């Protein structure tokens, strides 16, 4: 209900604020427990990430394998988000280039991986990748923070399902 | 995070420099 929804959203802003204050901030499991142990359903837990499709549409083979492939992609997408929150970025942060064989073997190895970068703001389609609109000179810090947290949380929840230790493993075993 | 993923990220971070 209301208290559970409020606790969830407040916990999200506490962590999103820490990311906006420090893009290199690491979070422990205990600091993420408000979100991992929340009794909210999946549609309520992930407001930006289409986590249902990300898991189910890449569920090919043994869960040991495609959860690892998806973990790597989510790990990389998280660092793309942290990169946009860093006050010191590389010069050409405004564009992601797909032709990199490392991009092709990580993010482009799962359906939906590209679309996550769009949630950061990489919205203009290129032949060789995705980029920010040339008018937008700086990224939406709050948006990038929320997506980054969700991408971090999704990888975390997948890892806890991998080790048979998710606090609400029963309900989330459907994925 | 595993160092193998940091290798991947460093290649992608290079593409942005
Ligand atoms: C393991 C490791 O050190 N990997 C690695 C990958 C890429 C790069 N740099 C560039 O691609 C520019 C350095 C190290
Ligand atoms: N660069």
Numbering used by the authors:
A (entry chain A): 3 to 177
B (entry chain C): 1 to 17
Question: What did the published study say regarding this structure?
Answer:
To target disease-causing proteins that are inaccessible to small-molecule or antibody therapies, we are exploring the use of a nature-inspired drug modality that exploits the intrinsically favorable properties of synthetically constrained α-helical polypeptides (Helicons). Here, we report a rapid, high-throughput screening platform utilizing phage display that enables an unbiased mapping of the α-helical interactome of a given protein without any prior knowledge of its structure or known binding partners. Analysis of 14 high-resolution crystal structures of Helicon–protein complexes across six different protein domains reveals a range of binding modes, all of which are “side-on”, i.e., mediated exclusively by Helicon side-chains rather than involving main chain amide interactions. Biochemical and structural experiments demonstrate diverse functional impacts by the Helicons which bind these sites, including inhibition of protein–protein interactions, inhibition of enzymatic activity, induced conformational rearrangement, and induced dimerization.
We began with the E3 ubiquitin ligase RNF31, which is an integral component of the linear ubiquitin chain assembly complex. RNF31 is a 1,072-amino acid protein comprised of multiple folded and disordered regions. We screened two of the nonenzymatic folded domains, the PUB and UBA domains, each at multiple concentrations and in the presence or absence of a known binding partner. Most hits for the RNF31 PUB domain could be grouped into two families of related clusters (C41 to C43 and C44 to C45), both of which competed with the natural binding partner Otulin, and both of which appeared to contain a critical tyrosine residue – also found in Otulin – but that had otherwise dissimilar logos. Upon solving X-ray cocrystal structures of member from a representative cluster of each family, we found that two Helicons, FP06649 from Cluster C44 and FP06652 from C41, bound the same site at the protein surface, but that they engaged this site using completely different binding modes, with the critical tyrosine residues oriented differently. This observation was our first structural evidence of the ability of Helicons to identify distinct binding solutions to a common site, which we have since observed for several other target proteins.
